[PDB]
Design a protein around this ligand. Structure first.
Ligand SMILES: *[C@@H]1O[C@H](CO)[C@@H](O[C@@H]2O[C@H](CO)[C@@H](O[C@@H]3O[C@H](CO[C@H]4O[C@H](CO)[C@@H](O)[C@H](O)[C@@H]4O)[C@@H](O)[C@H](O[C@H]4O[C@H](CO[C@H]5O[C@H](CO)[C@@H](O)[C@H](O)[C@@H]5O)[C@@H](O)[C@H](O)[C@@H]4O[C@H]4O[C@H](CO)[C@@H](O)[C@H](O)[C@@H]4O)[C@@H]3O)[C@H](O)[C@H]2NC(C)=O)[C@H](O)[C@H]1NC(C)=O
Ligand SMILES: *[C@@H]1O[C@H](CO)[C@@H](O[C@@H]2O[C@H](CO)[C@@H](O[C@@H]3O[C@H](CO[C@H]4O[C@H](CO)[C@@H](O)[C@H](O[C@H]5O[C@H](CO)[C@@H](O)[C@H](O)[C@@H]5O)[C@@H]4O)[C@@H](O)[C@H](O[C@H]4O[C@H](CO)[C@@H](O)[C@H](O)[C@@H]4O)[C@@H]3O)[C@H](O)[C@H]2NC(C)=O)[C@H](O)[C@H]1NC(C)=O
Ligand SMILES: *[C@@H]1O[C@H](CO)[C@@H](O[C@@H]2O[C@H](CO)[C@@H](O[C@@H]3O[C@H](CO[C@H]4O[C@H](CO)[C@@H](O)[C@H](O)[C@@H]4O)[C@@H](O)[C@H](O[C@H]4O[C@H](CO)[C@@H](O)[C@H](O)[C@@H]4O)[C@@H]3O)[C@H](O)[C@H]2NC(C)=O)[C@H](O)[C@H]1NC(C)=O
Ligand SMILES: *[C@@H]1O[C@H](CO)[C@@H](O[C@@H]2O[C@H](CO)[C@@H](O[C@@H]3O[C@H](CO)[C@@H](O)[C@H](O[C@H]4O[C@H](CO)[C@@H](O)[C@H](O)[C@@H]4O)[C@@H]3O)[C@H](O)[C@H]2NC(C)=O)[C@H](O)[C@H]1NC(C)=O
Ligand SMILES: *[C@@H]1O[C@H](CO)[C@@H](O[C@@H]2O[C@H](CO)[C@@H](O[C@@H]3O[C@H](CO)[C@@H](O)[C@H](O)[C@@H]3O)[C@H](O)[C@H]2NC(C)=O)[C@H](O)[C@H]1NC(C)=O
Length: 278
């Protein structure tokens, strides 16, 4: 039970009783229909038009992740009041609440982006993971390195989403998504992002057999988020006990994803020929 907290997020003020079911930003998404899991079904609760989360190109962007809005800077809009305590994502509860045994058992999370001012036109295939932090859901203030060559977003801004998948060894398995209005500052480029593609289970994982990574099986360009364990619209089909992660395992390098642009690979990706055969 963790959520990305900011005034530019969708469903910023959604509470337990707002919907017939519990659909608070921190509620996990599992075996849901597209409408339920996509954007956490918070499209009808958009932020104010002027509130945007800024991503400075070539610089870090601090985000707040917590089990309660009271544990973040946005506590004044939360009912419990201020309970924040430094880098603790959930004050008063242990790390099992963030679904991890320790700092070594965290599986990382990501920030995706879709260059579209109208949220209604955004499709799951449109999101591109542009920044990752592999030590995610450990620190409340989690920084995300933004690529230097990020182009400027359209007139009405663009949309982003925070995703997270945790280890199987702690609690029930699910995915996490929190969409929000974002914008890019310090842009020194106009080369757009490449059409993102499904991330393949590339890297090594001794636990599930293969101890050696398979470079030839990687997805190298722009990558889509990991949609998994839902009733509809999945791009990953791994078993409950072998979940995908925002790690080296799916070629999600720690830090900024600098190879997501059209001009990134000059000679292209010949490995995509092997995808055409299937
Ligand atoms: C190159 O990239 C590609 C793309 O990312 C990678 O392909 C993916 O590989 C995943 C891991 O192998 C694989 O996950 C599996 O999903 C299936 C379900 O998918 C099926 O249905 C979909 C329909 O949409 C279809 O698309 C698929 O093609 C499939 O037909 C699950 O059943 C699998 O779960 C079984 O395996 C796991 C893995 O356990 C390993 O580790 C244990 C512990 O050491 C070991 O004992 C075991 O032998 C394995 O080595 C198990 O944890 C589960 O319990 C399941 O157990 C199997 O074995 C049981 C007996 O032990 C059987 O009783 C049982 O029926 C089952 O067969 C698994 O999660 C993705 O589906 C796959 N995606 C695609 C698109 O291909 C590829 O790995 C990657 N790397 C390369 C090439 O190196
Ligand atoms: C509840 O608590 C929240 C959180 O404290 C309060 O929210 C704050 O509201 C104010 C307005 O009352 C917000 O002001 C906005 O400021 C932005 C500018 O960016 C700001 O936010 C960035 C993201 O966090 C931040 O990076 C910025 O820079 C800070 O840090 C640097 C580096 O250390 C430092 O150098 C700066 O001095 C800053 O400290 C900055 O804080 C602005 O864009 C907003 O829009 C106005 O301006 C634009 C300009 O064109 C205009 O178009 C708009 O119409 C609008 O006029 C706005 O001024 C502030 O951002 C909020 N706080 C935070 C942390 O985000 C909330 O008010 C509280 N409620 C109540 C009832 O008190
Ligand atoms: C994954 O996410 C983690 C968590 O966010 C990131 O780790 C952080 O990394 C950043 C950048 O390296 C660190 O930020 C720096 O922290 C320094 C120390 O801060 C201490 O002191 C302050 C005092 O107020 C305390 O509040 C705080 O708790 C710390 O104890 C600062 O010295 C740095 O300041 C920099 O900026 C200022 C102005 O903004 C400049 O004046 C300075 O010169 C300086 O450059 C900065 O704040 C942060 O400490 C790390 N956090 C943790 C918990 O480790 C990872 O980087 C990220 N990984 C990836 C790959 O993205
Ligand atoms: C997403 O981020 C981008 C990049 O930051 C952002 O576009 C930029 O917005 C800023 C701030 O509005 C723009 O700066 C303005 O530019 C216009 C010129 O077109 C000026 O009119 C503005 O200055 C006026 O006011 C000043 C007084 O404060 C006067 O001194 C001055 O003479 C002007 O009257 C101001 O400089 C900037 O031009 C754009 N574009 C770029 C490339 O930076 C975009 O708005 C953000 N999206 C949002 C908020 O939805
Ligand atoms: C989500 O809920 C929070 C918390 O209620 C909202 O904050 C509230 O916003 C309103 C409207 O902007 C604020 O009211 C204003 O008060 C000032 C007082 O100076 C007044 O000048 C304005 O005309 C207006 O009446 C209010 O202060 C603020 N807090 C509370 C407790 O009501 C927030 O707007 C909501 N955001 C979203 C996206 O739903």
């Amino acid at each position: 039970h963790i959520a990305f907290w900011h005034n530019s997020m969708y469903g910023f003020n959604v509470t337990e009783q707002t919907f017939p079911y519990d659909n608070r930003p921190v509620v996990p998404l599992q075996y849901m229909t597209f409408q339920e899991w996509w954007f956490h079904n918070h499209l009808d609760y958009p932020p104010h038009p002027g509130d945007f989360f800024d991503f400075p190109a070539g610089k870090a962007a601090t985000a707040e992740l917590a089990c309660n809005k009271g544990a973040t800077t946005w506590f004044n809009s939360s009912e419990g009041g201020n309970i924040q305590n430094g880098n603790d994502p959930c004050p008063g509860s242990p790390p099992s609440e963030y679904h991890t045994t320790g700092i070594d058992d965290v599986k990382g999370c990501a920030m995706a982006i879709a260059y579209e001012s109208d949220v209604r036109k955004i499709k799951p295939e449109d999101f591109t993971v542009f920044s990752v932090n592999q030590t995610c859901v450990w620190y409340r203030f989690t920084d995300f390195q933004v690529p230097e060559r990020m182009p400027p977003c359209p007139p009405g801004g663009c949309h982003c989403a925070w995703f997270w998948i945790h280890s199987p060894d702690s609690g029930g398995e699910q995915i996490y998504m929190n969409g929000f209005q974002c914008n890019i500052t310090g842009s020194t480029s106009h080369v757009p992002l490449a059409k993102p593609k499904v991330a393949r289970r590339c890297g090594a994982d001794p636990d599930h057999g293969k101890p050696d990574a398979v470079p030839g099986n990687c997805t190298y360009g722009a990558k889509q988020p990991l949609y998994w364990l839902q009733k509809e619209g999945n791009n990953e089909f791994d078993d409950y006990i072998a979940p995908p992660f925002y790690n080296d395992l799916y070629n999600f390098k720690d830090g900024a994803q600098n190879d997501i642009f059209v001009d990134s690979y000059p000679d292209g990706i010949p490995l995509e020929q092997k995808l055409i055969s299937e």
